[PDB]
Amino acid sequence: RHNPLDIQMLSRGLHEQIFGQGGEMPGEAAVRRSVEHLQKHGLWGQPAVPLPDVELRLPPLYGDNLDQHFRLLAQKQSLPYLEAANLLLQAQLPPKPPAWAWAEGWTRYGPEGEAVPVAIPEERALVFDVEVCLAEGTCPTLAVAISPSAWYSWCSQRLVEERYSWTSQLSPADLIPLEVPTGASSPTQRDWQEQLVVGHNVSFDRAHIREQYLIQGSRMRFLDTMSMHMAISGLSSFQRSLWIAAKQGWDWLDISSVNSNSLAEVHRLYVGGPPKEPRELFVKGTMKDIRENFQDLMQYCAQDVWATHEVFQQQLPLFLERCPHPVTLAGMLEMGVSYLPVNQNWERYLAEAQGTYEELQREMKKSLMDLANDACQLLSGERYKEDPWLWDLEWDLQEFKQKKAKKVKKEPATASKLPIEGAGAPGDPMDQEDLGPCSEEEEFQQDVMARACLQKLKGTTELLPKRPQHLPGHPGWYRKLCPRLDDPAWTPGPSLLSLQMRVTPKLMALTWDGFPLHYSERHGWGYLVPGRRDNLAKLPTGTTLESAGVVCPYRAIESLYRKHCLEQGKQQLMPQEAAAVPGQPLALTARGGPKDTQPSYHHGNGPYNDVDIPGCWFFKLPHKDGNSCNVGSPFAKDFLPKMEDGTLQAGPGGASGPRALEINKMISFWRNAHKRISSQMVVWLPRSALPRAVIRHPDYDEEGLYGAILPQVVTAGTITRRAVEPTWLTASNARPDRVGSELKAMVQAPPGYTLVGADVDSQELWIAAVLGDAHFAGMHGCTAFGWMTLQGRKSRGTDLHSKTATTVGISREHAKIFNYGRIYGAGQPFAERLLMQFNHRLTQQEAAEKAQQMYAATKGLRWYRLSDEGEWLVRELNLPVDRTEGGWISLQDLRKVQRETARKSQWKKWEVVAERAWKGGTESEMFNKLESIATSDIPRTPVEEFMTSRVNWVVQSSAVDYLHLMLVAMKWLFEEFAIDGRFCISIHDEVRYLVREEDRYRAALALQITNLLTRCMFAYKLGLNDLPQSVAFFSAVDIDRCLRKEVTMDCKTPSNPTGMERRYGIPQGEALDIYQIIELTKGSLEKRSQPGP
Amino acid sequence: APGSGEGSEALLEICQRRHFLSGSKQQLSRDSLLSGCHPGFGPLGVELRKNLAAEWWTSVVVFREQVFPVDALHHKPGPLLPGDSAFRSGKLRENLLHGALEHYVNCLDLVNKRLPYGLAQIGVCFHPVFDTKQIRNGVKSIGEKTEASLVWFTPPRTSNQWLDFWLRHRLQWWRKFAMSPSNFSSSDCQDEEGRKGNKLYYNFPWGKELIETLWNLGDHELLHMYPGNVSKLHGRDGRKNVVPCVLSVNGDLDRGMLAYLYDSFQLTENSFTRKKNLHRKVLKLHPCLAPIKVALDVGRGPTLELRQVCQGLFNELLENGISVWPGYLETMQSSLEQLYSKYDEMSILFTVLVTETTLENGLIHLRSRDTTMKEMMHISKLKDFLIKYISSAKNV
Amino acid sequence: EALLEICQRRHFLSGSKQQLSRDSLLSGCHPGFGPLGVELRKNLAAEWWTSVVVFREQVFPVDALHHKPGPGKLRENLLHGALEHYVNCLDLVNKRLPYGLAQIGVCFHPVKSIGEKTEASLVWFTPPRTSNQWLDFWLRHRLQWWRKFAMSPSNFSSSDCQDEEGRKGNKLYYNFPWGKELIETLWNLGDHELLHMYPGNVSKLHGRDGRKNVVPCVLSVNGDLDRGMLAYLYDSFQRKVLKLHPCLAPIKVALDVGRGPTLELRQVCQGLFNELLENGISVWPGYLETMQSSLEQLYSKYDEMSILFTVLVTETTLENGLIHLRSRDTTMKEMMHISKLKDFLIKYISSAKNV
């Protein structure tokens, strides 16, 4: 239809549920105010140079007020589960702890007793819990049940089952084929009529739901008791933490602190403690014994669990709907029932993955080991048994047998293995085993003469030096072989203690950021102030005789930071602007680095005490993001890694440490990621998989694994409710390449299937967008598409973000993120801080200039605003007051004005419950993430009461809403024929769904359209009655058996593993676009569009 | 560039001297060296390449599957259809793999026809260097290189994965024997046909070099070799039938070795921009790497008793399974220090100078090994510590 | 030949019937060397590598060329390559005397027709005086190689030849019923196969008595290996069974599944196989393989595959750990602790280099 434009095309899809050019934009004032602008913000005149096209032809919908039809969609999903939940909620018969029981169910809350579990809950609705051993098996050992009755299982009969003990191999390894056999209680009940929804708190119940979903079909839906909590009674990152310290052991605890326990404290409050848990933790680690203790108590665990379920629940709904939406609720119902494919490959993609981190370390070690070796030695100096020896000697320790008791006074028939030393238990030593042969000697000649004379010579050499019984029982040399130092002791995966070994940095000569010194091993770095102060090595004739005399290691250690000295200074100009142990700067003085002082966010210097000889040193920054102590680590995660890739760092002459820092840099991300990743373990489809020879056509080894892992996506969670899967909802491409420098691909791969999904850009930036514009009168705007302006212009909008940095000519990926940030919570100080660090010397003052400015430009007129934030002027003006929703709906409870609210009270939250609140900001942002923080650069998307939080969360809370529709509509439409498949994703700005191959094109429309709607709908509530083209037809909808954003990619890196998509499995298939996709599907389906393509 | 040239002389000169490269002259110059118009390698030369073949060889032999082209035959007399002469020069194998093939079907009878393995061994093949012509007679000259070819007759499925499997393994082998293995990449530069199999290279002081190779020319040459009615035996899957695939054989090059001594001391730049210039350097071979493990030593009197028992160590040592340099001779030439230097310039791990301190200072395994650990060693434990040394060192 | 037919079995040499003749085999012209031969060969040569090479580290591995430009010739007197490097390596040991420079190079002679003789060579250089002493004895040395603490090598002949243009040294032969054959030929070029080759300022070469500069003598210790196994290939033979000198036997042991039978037992055997391989012992499993192949129709192949032992891993072991094994000489089926089996063999092995 047509092509109309008081702005951006809208055409004829509208006619059905909207109007294309239909928004009642009022005459001169309204149409003009918006226009008067941009003469100031410089946008119009040329905006009239568009690339407008689209031909839209779709009739799938009916309703009056799209949302009216949205609440309907929400209605269907929400209802069947509302009904089965209803009855679980009003249920009358409390708890019945009978004796206890054993495995698979039956019942037993009883007039008397139990049994009859041949098969599962005919219950129609219940709750459940699950335990899993440190037998580490992610598999079960008991599952607790309420409304009807159900039960515990094979943990505790498991304990009399085979295979030998702990830490190697054993049976549960083969318990991986246990999955299919086990189920999750079948996993299901029937899918025939009413399906029990399940209200629980968090994970691994998410594991009861580790098996309830998986077979790819199932109308069970759940919802956290912890999620909702977050949702209703939740607290912010920093506020809660401050709130936590003071709270257990001053305004509005009503703390509602995630987990269960602290929430029950707020909802109900009695029997409020932990029936169980002092146990189960005093060794969420000891088993074999477990059953004993279990039999007696595990019923306890159960029950405690129940109350929670019951206590949060019967009270958790009402207040939830006290913030009343159908959609929010239904959208989260499916979010929880998410899925993730996997194949034979995860473990392998993951195991090849594991092989590399080692190589790497193993390798820097030798490098290291060697470089340190070379170094220390080449410096002929002083006297042996001291000085650089000390260094080389500690790190390298080996061939020791001194101690640790064990066996002794008992042991059986030695195989020439006889540890000496050995002290307390080991010394009820007795006679035996030493003598010589009749037998024979090897060569006839002087050889025997000599050979045999040698042992004589040697043998006696023993009667010679040292003590004689060391000989009895010869050693075998504990361990290693070359130059390496051994802290071991600690098993905790991914560890390399030779770097914590202070000293490594003087070795690995390192200064160069702020240009130089070399460093001190872990604190700060020297400079060149040939004092005339600092140094009075001076003289005269005195110095001659006495300097040499020395007195203390100091004059020798001093002489060293002094040779070290002139050289550091000469050495600095040369590279910057380019010996008997006292030649290599770092090493000498540094001996023992780098000492007292404080991290103290020291842009500064150390007023003596510290401070000796010719050069001054700046106790290297920074540490806020670290938060509390002295730098301590050169490779310290956080700031430091950033600078390794950073502009400044060291290893001056060659490959050396660059290789080193560079190497480690590669693996850091994986270390930590590592554990969490390897951990999900998994379950698999054995034979009762996808039928129809569907299994057949896809192509399939049949010698591979086709199971899948499911991660707890906290329904809600977050105060924004966004998501709660560190590992999986923290997906990333691979900028800092390497193992798990994303296993994303491997993630999905079922044969007969493929996954439709996509990415909406600034799904967040745009929301912020119309919001303001819409309230700056006509929603066209300024920042937001007013200022996002029509612009894309060849490269694209990042070129706009680019505009932000070019005026202020600078990198953009570093500039873009901070606006997002500006968009979020505060501005002013935060820019200076972050910008400063990532930036350099302009110092606080210049930082000021820039921070203030950037903020000035998008929000810098008097009282509160001009530039770009009439919206925030509204987020702020609408939200510094009462409690609210986000113009769309749903309420975010904790509140500055609103925490305060029955007027001005009690010192007014101290007036520093608010000042302690002044302190959280910046720290909180570099903290926000527990895993990695602010992310890696090149992408990096991660973001007490008062604006900041609140304001930041509006956008966020509102992008949650966003997610739910995409979802609600899609779920809806899948039902709506052309059936397809699954998923919840809701990852970042990505939302992937699974589909059979066919109707994979079909879903494409779904998504497409679903967004149009979402988008469409947003404006009507938010702003009013209309919206544009560009957004409408996304970018394109992506289809592939792989999981990476923007298909062709190929993902070399994991630097390892990297034959990748060659190393193979899959390899990239495009996302159709909007125009194309519609061509094949032609007006969607039933079974009608069908033949031709 | 001038610094790069100096590094080369250092790493080459040391090779002429200290005997690693038998021949001297222009036929040796980098370019020529790589072509092969060189006279050869020192004994040292042999010990390393042998260790290598040997060391590399062990890995190859291990898994459930393993065999040989069995022979490796310069050979090849014959006319027309098999190989096609293109240009000019000679008749000495150019495909250790080719032969490996005739042996194929029988290699097939092997393992019960069961298998889908890798049939191979090591031997010398010849390369000619013919930049370009015109001047006089024509097509003269010849270069030589000792290769390792592993063939594999793989199903359509061992396929890309089995090829890719190799990628993996090979790479970990190098790093294993590499002092700074980051100079060992792979590319996938070629073919609009047969598809993948990547080329390998080393990062010399002047860029990359082609080393090993890796193709998947899955079952295309056998059809070439053994015509059929669409004949013969296909080969077993395990109850089905298939025509066996290609196995990419990194060639050899003496070069792999050639890059190692590089890696080791390659490590030029090492101290090119760091510390004071006392850059005497040392070459560095992973222990298993080095041709010689240690230089026995002996000094003072009686001159013999000590030359003796060194005599003594050697055998004991010789016997154990340790390469040695006997230093009785050694007391003669030089003065202590340059011994060190030579040795370090030699890679010989540690050195023990049995002198007055040796019996008469009754005992002592006298010190040497670097990072300057001149710690006294009662001769034995240590001797048998070295036995350990190898073991752990090797392992990784 | 009786052995001839068994000899190929699963080809222990590449070549059909008429392809390989007891003359083409003596010509190496045969279609080529086969499977099991190599192990032996790599095995053989290697033990020689010890023979003279490992024993008294007075000598070293020299690397001589295979081809020659200019007059375009073939590698026939591998004894030559050494010549060129003498000067090259002389510098090695100050200037002392004497020693050699071993190099097992596949030399030549391709009889018209052609073939390749693998061979190995040693080139020691002794002075005139104690030349003869440090000469006749030499025979003695490896006299024992091949004999190497014999089985049937109670039949290794040696003949003396007057003369020739070298100054003599004797040849080597083996007791071939059909027709004896020359195995190695040691010379005594006490004279010049240098001199001209390395003329001019003779004082540049030469060696020493102990204090006096002199030009040493020239020697040859070659006969070619390629077939050196061909011979040893006969002491063996005398139901079908082929016994062999342990340390030599290309492979060392074998095994398959049994009683278990499917799955795990088989997997365990392979792992065991792998463990034995790590330190240094060849072997052969028969898993996945889908048939029992009997036990005496499969054991005759061990004979024919002149193996050495076996280890029938069974289920009467999964709860005890005891396999029933044999040997390929006298069958006295024994029982054994399948584990200590690691340091086992080494005995029968290391000590097999004894008697």
Curated annotation (Swiss-Prot), chain A:
The record marks R722, Q956 as: Critical for replication fidelity and mismatch recognition. Its EC number is 2.7.7.7, 3.1.11.-, 4.2.99.-. One of its GO terms (biological process) is base-excision repair. It comes from the Eukaryota. It catalyses: DNA(n) + a 2'-deoxyribonucleoside 5'-triphosphate = DNA(n+1) + diphosphate; a 3'-end 2'-deoxyribonucleotidyl-deoxyribonucleotide-DNA + H2O = a 3'-end 2'-deoxyribonucleotide-DNA + a 2'-deoxyribonucleoside 5'-phosphate + H(+); a 5'-end 2'-deoxyribose-2'-deoxyribonucleotide-DNA = (2E,4S)-4-hydroxypenten-2-al-5-phosphate + a 5'-end 5'-phospho-2'-deoxyribonucleoside-DNA + H(+). Changing G234R: In MTDPS4A; likely pathogenic; results in loss of exonuclease activity and formation of an unligatable 5'-flap; displays low polymerization activity and reduced DNA-binding affinity. DNA binds at S237, S498, K675, T718, T948, S949. A motif (Pol B) lies at residues 812-827. Residues 415-476 are annotated as: Accessory-interacting determinant. Changing L457N: Decreases processive DNA synthesis. PROSITE patterns: DNA_POLYMERASE_A (PS00447). It is found in: Mitochondrion; Mitochondrion matrix, Mitochondrion nucleoid. Changing Q239H: In PEOB1; sporadic case. Residues 727-733 are annotated as: Trigger loop. Changing R467Q: In PEOB1; sporadic case. A motif (Pol C) lies at residues 988-995. Keywords: Disease variant, DNA replication, DNA-binding, DNA-directed DNA polymerase, Epilepsy, Hydrolase, Leigh syndrome, Lyase, Magnesium, Mitochondrion, Mitochondrion nucleoid, Neurodegeneration, Neuropathy, Nucleotidyltransferase, Primary mitochondrial disease, Progressive external ophthalmoplegia, Transferase. The polymerase domain encompasses three conserved active site motifs: Pol A (residues 887-896), Pol B (residues 943-958) and Pol C (residues 1134-1141). Binds the incoming dNTPs and undergoes an open to close coformation change to catalyze the formation of phosphodiester bond. The 3' -> 5' exonuclease domain comprises three conserved active site motifs: Exo I (residues 196-200), Exo II (residues 267-275) and Exo III (residues 395-403). Proofreads the newly synthesized DNA strand. It is linked to Progressive external ophthalmoplegia with mitochondrial DNA deletions, autosomal dominant, 1: A disorder characterized by progressive weakness of ocular muscles and levator muscle of the upper eyelid. In a minority of cases, it is associated with skeletal myopathy, which predominantly involves axial or proximal muscles and which causes abnormal fatigability and even permanent muscle weakness. Ragged-red fibers and atrophy are found on muscle biopsy. A large proportion of chronic ophthalmoplegias are associated with other symptoms, leading to a multisystemic pattern of this disease. This is DNA polymerase subunit gamma-1. It comes from Homo sapiens (Human). The gene is POLG.
Curated annotation (Swiss-Prot), chain C:
It comes from the Eukaryota. Pfam families: HGTP_anticodon (PF03129). Changing D303Y: In MTDPS16B; decreased DNA polymerase processivity factor activity; results in decreased stability; affects the secondary structure as shown by circular dichroism spectroscopy. It is found in: Mitochondrion; Mitochondrion matrix, Mitochondrion nucleoid. Gene3D superfamilies: Anticodon-binding domain (3.40.50.800), Bira Bifunctional Protein, Domain 2 (3.30.930.10). Keywords: Disease variant, DNA replication, DNA-binding, Mitochondrion, Mitochondrion nucleoid, Phosphoprotein, Primary mitochondrial disease, Progressive external ophthalmoplegia, Transit peptide. GO terms for cellular component: cytoplasm; gamma DNA polymerase complex; mitochondrial matrix; mitochondrial nucleoid; mitochondrion. It is linked to Progressive external ophthalmoplegia with mitochondrial DNA deletions, autosomal dominant, 4: A disorder characterized by progressive weakness of ocular muscles and levator muscle of the upper eyelid. In a minority of cases, it is associated with skeletal myopathy, which predominantly involves axial or proximal muscles and which causes abnormal fatigability and even permanent muscle weakness. Ragged-red fibers and atrophy are found on muscle biopsy. A large proportion of chronic ophthalmoplegias are associated with other symptoms, leading to a multisystemic pattern of this disease. Mitochondrial DNA depletion syndrome 16, hepatic type: An autosomal recessive disorder characterized by poor feeding, difficulty breathing, abdominal distention, an abnormal carnitine profile, metabolic acidosis and hepatic failure in the neonatal period. Severe mtDNA depletion is observed in liver and muscle biopsies. Heterotrimer composed of a catalytic subunit and a homodimer of accessory subunits (POLG:POLG2). This is DNA polymerase subunit gamma-2. It comes from Homo sapiens (Human). The lineage of its organism: Eukaryota, Metazoa, Chordata, Craniata, Vertebrata.
